Design a protein around this ligand. Structure first.
Ligand SMILES: CC(C)(COP(=O)(O)OP(=O)(O)OC[C@H]1O[C@@H](n2cnc3c(N)ncnc32)[C@H](O)[C@@H]1OP(=O)(O)O)[C@@H](O)C(=O)NCCC(=O)NCCS
Ligand SMILES: CC(C)(COP(=O)(O)OP(=O)(O)OC[C@H]1O[C@@H](n2cnc3c(N)ncnc32)[C@H](O)[C@@H]1OP(=O)(O)O)[C@@H](O)C(=O)NCCC(=O)NCCS
Ligand SMILES: *C(=O)CCCC[C@@H]1SC[C@@H]2NC(=O)N[C@@H]21
Lengths: 537, 82, 537
């Protein structure tokens, strides 16, 4: 197959190259460094105050739980970043996928150090987002509960609605029903809300003289029919392991607890459901870091994606579909770490052709049960009078139906710009890709900065024109100012990943490494047959 | 000369060929030794090339074919299609 | 299992053996040489005028596409032999199954050399017979499109009806829906009819400056609202790869085009669904060559079938069912190149107990999901007055029900005579065996030469008898003459394979290896459970 090879045209030595490579790499260190700060939790301050109570710290409980040197895919680390007034590191809960007794597991634990480990809205959003990855990919669940309650001041966004707290239990009872075991480790306070995570879980474990599961802790219970009693008396580890039966395992301490945990994950008689025709894993043909220099630093300076593909696929072998048709969209087959995958990467605009090319490709990947990988760097759909009277409208729709309907594992990485219709047709957040990631240079918004400022300002001088007047560049310029900046802001990776519109920002040069991880994990669950809606021809 | 024939180096320009025949040249049998020797029988030891027989091509073809087992499917190994 | 062995009773050195083996081998050489003539296609003539255009010949295209030294089972090579007025080599379409990227594939290509590659009635029949083997055994299809149109003079038998052209498109869209990839390689003209073969296909390849896919070629298009345009401009290679999108891959020439093709079959994520308890392959105990002399030369001369059995099964081990009962039909279990199989081979007439024996066997076979192997050499059902009053009618029916309904893989091979009810009770063409083959010595017909002339002429003097007259040996003999010769003509293998009543005439001493190839190939498709109709007790 020495012809399915992608011969680069990138000079790793060129000036231009190191130029891009430069700003790219800077961006990665920008992320590298913020990521470290968030590993701080509630800060050196109370963090030390934690260890004082004899409690292993959050991120350490995880390292201890995982298998010797197993990897760990963390989700939305930038969670709630610069979102609430205060600082709430990783939204007070760290979750991710890691090996435990030879099973790719979804692990969720709270940082009792971040504002008491209580649930701010984004905490619930992230906790939930994990059980989604848990369900969608069938990975058993380990919950390391150690939280206060729900952040009382902001409850109107934590308690009522469908996707608020309490949907946590829903999801748990359902996964337990679909046979994705639910395991719990209580290593702290567990008042009211989070009181159910331990009570609704196939198996539960408690750390004596530390863990407490009560629907109403002493604060509330004194506020009840008076009554005054201690934490360990009310609902401690001995109360629920020897008497009630809300716990199943009596642990000695954080380290023991985790040990008991692993042992449960051991007798799971677990078998993976996926099934692809994976081949022996061959590394790419070019250093994966060369990427730093493949990506222009000039936001809107066109480059060829095939160069990006060349650095992720195995042996930089790529078989391209409708090679020279609707070139704005690149499609093809190849493998990644053995697993066969179908790629759809943007290479410019997106005229009708592209859409059709894409719909047609999906049909083929959907028929052979091959997972799809979307590479977004879409600026939008070519507009105009002919392009529109040509159905660039309905053609684009054929693409979405395809994507929207595809039941094969779908994966999305933002390596350019997700702006407008584009984001959708390329399996954006709203289309359930099992995972969706963002490079640091990627920018996502409804449309460009002045683009919006353009229309939003223009109607203002159209309503005011057929109104016997006009808008002088005085008020016009003041109607554009705010928007121009607003968009610049709401388009950066941090802004996105802090709100979970992505399961995180990643290292461009590690993309492959994460894609294979994901895929593998996504194979814990069967690849389903696909059923397409109606296709507007 | 035995050793020189049991040795095989491939994927590069080698003098392994030259030596084989310089130990075998009849001049080497007798003490016809001096420092011009290598120059002298120059022809005898550095012959001119030639796309030799089909005799070759044939074997080379049969040899090549016999060193690619085809493919054995995990589905049915015993598959005679291999 | 040194008991399940078949110890031979044939002396390979006897004179009688050498006698049979003689006229047998001649028969085979007879086939040998014809098959060579057919390899010529439209004759050195235009065949060379082909390579002229820089086009690779048909069978050459196939060997290039196949895997290095893969085997290739060809189908109905004697296709259309001495059928049409002119010579229409292998019906101008070569089809067969072969390894392509480790997948047993169904391949079909047209011989541009044979009368312009157009579809004569049987070209269509052969084409469709291929898609059958393809759907029935789940073998991905590779169409090497290079045909004129449909043979204009004989359209009445090539266009309308159900199983006529256009049913090619029917099977095609259905195969792509039942998930059997449909790959198309265009390497010549492809006007009108065959224009859909590449239009209706998961993936399609075109050879530049040579491939042409259009509804109406320039002859027809000029015959339209005038207009005179060239081949290359109307529907060339560059038009459908860069403009319309009817093609997907732009190949530089015949060799490239096939290479592109291979690649597609490579990203199929294909997996076989058959499933048997195959055991390690162990060769027979008697040279399969010796078959030549086991089969008598005197057509209606009694021989023991178990002899042919012993030279095909693994280790000539064969366990016989209802050993000594209605011995006219021999039934047993054995293995063939690993694959276990249940056999039913004729050994004479066929009384009532023989069919009850065979129907009972088919139940055990169909109950364990073991392939069925039929070896026909049946002259008919024993007739008589007590015989008929004994139900040789309803019991015979019992057999056919079982055969017609058996859903495991059925394989038939004619090694004697397919005559009358026999052919049906032994899985003849109409019972859809996955594959049906014919030996050089075997003859097929509704009933013997004179047998039919017997009755056919008898009635003529029965209607002329109760009509106050009689049949004089002068008219009766002129009634039977034409029949006695007709039957001899349409009873011969060439006549049969010529009209696709079988997927080809084979080498008796090669049988064993054809069966292995087939069986394995049919394991690309799941052995389905069987449901029997009502049994007339
Ligand atoms: C959970 C609890 C035992 C904390 O014990 P602790 O380890 O001593 O932690 P602290 O009491 O020091 O709490 C410190 C932080 O927790 C936060 N916190 C605790 N519970 C909270 C809640 N329910 N809502 C909002 N904030 C809460 C406080 O705001 C405080 O923030 P600060 O550090 O910035 O000042 C105590 O807060 C408690 O009893 N809370 C009960 C929670 C509850 O009843 N929730 C029911 C709603 S479902
Ligand atoms: C197919 C075509 C391009 C042939 O190109 P070519 O390579 O130059 O081949 P030629 O023109 O030399 O054709 C030679 C043979 O093709 C045969 N032929 C071609 N198309 C035929 C058809 N549709 N019906 C009957 N015969 C046909 C001719 O009878 C001729 O026979 P001959 O060699 O015994 O004299 C040309 O015949 C054509 O344009 N045909 C259109 C077919 C069509 O419109 N069919 C629609 C029905 S589905
Ligand atoms: C930035 O350049 C956005 C392009 C604006 C074009 C318009 S806005 C969203 C619509 N969808 C799309 O693909 N482009 C359209």
């Amino acid at each position: 197959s020495h012809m399915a090879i992608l011969h680069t045209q990138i000079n790793p030595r060129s000036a231009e190259f190191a130029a891009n490579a430069a700003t790219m790499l800077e961006q990665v260190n920008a992320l590298r460094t913020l990521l470290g700060r968030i590993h701080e939790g509630g800060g050196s301050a109370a963090q030390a105050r934690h260890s004082a109570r004899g409690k292993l710290l959050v991120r350490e409980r995880i390292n201890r739980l995982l298998d010797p040197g197993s990897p760990f895919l963390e989700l939305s680390a930038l969670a709630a970043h610069e979102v609430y007034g205060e600082e709430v590191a990783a939204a007070g809960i760290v979750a991710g996928i890691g090996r435990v007794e030879g099973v790719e597991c979804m692990i969720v634990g709270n940082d009792a150090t971040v504002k008491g480990g209580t649930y701010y809205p984004l905490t619930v959003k992230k906790h939930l987002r994990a059980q989604a990855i848990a369900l969608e990919n069938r990975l058993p669940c380990i919950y390391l509960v150690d939280s206060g309650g729900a952040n009382l001041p902001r409850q109107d966004e934590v308690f009522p609605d469908r996707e608020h707290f309490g949907r946590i239990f829903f999801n748990q009872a359902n996964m337990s029903a679909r046979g994705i075991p639910q395991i719990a480790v209580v290593m702290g306070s567990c008042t009211a809300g989070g009181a159910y995570v331990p009570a609704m879980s196939d198996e539960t474990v408690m750390v004596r003289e530390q863990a407490t599961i009560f629907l109403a802790g002493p604060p509330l219970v004194k506020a009840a029919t008076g009554e005054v009693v201690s934490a360990e008396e009310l609902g401690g580890a001995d109360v629920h392991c020897k008497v009630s039966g809300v716990a199943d395992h009596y642990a000695e301490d954080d380290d023991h607890a985790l040990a008991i945990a692993r042992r449960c994950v051991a007798n799971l008689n677990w078998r993976k459901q996926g099934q692809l025709q994976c081949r022996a894993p061959r590394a790419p043909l070019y250093p994966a870091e060369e990427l730093y220099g493949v990506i222009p630093a000039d936001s809107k300076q066109p480059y060829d994606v095939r160069e990006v593909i060349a650095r992720l696929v195995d042996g930089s072998e790529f078989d391209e579909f409708k090679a020279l048709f609707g070139t704005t969209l690149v499609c093809g087959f190849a493998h990644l770490h053995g697993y066969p995958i179908a790629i759809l990467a943007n290479n410019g605009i997106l005229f009708a052709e592209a859409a059709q090319k894409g719909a047609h490709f999906i049909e083929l990947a959907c028929q052979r049960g091959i997972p799809l990988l979307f590479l977004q760097n879409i600026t939008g759909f070519m507009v105009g009078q002919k392009y529109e009277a040509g159905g660039i409208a309905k053609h684009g729709a054929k693409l979405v139906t395809a994507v929207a309907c595809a039941r094969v594992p779908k994966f999305t990485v933002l390596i350019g710009g997700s702006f407008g219709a584009g984001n959708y047709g390329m399996c954006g957040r709203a289309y359930d890709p099992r995972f969706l990631w963002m490079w640091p240079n990627a920018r996502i918004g409804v449309m460009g900065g002045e683009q919006a400022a353009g229309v939003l300002a223009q109607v203002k001088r159209e309503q005011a024109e057929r109104a016997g007047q006009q808008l002088g560049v005085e008020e016009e310029a003041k109607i554009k100012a705010p928007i121009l900046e607003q968009y610049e802001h709401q388009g950066h990776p941090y802004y996105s990943s802090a709100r979970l519109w992505d399961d995180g920002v990643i290292d461009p040069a590690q993309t492959r490494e994460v894609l294979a991880l994901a895929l593998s994990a996504a194979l814990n669950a069967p690849i389903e047959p696909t059923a397409f809606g109606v296709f507007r021809m | 000369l035995a050793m020189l024939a049991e040795t095989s180096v491939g994927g590069l320009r080698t003098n392994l060929a030259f030596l084989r025949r310089i130990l075998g040249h009849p001049a080497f049998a007798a003490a016809e030794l001096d420092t011009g020797f290598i120059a002298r029988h120059q022809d005898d030891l550095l012959p001119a090339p030639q796309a030799l027989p089909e005799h070759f091509w044939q074997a080379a073809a049969e040899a090549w074919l016999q060193s690619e087992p085809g493919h054995r499917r995990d589905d049915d190994p015993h598959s005679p299609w291999s």
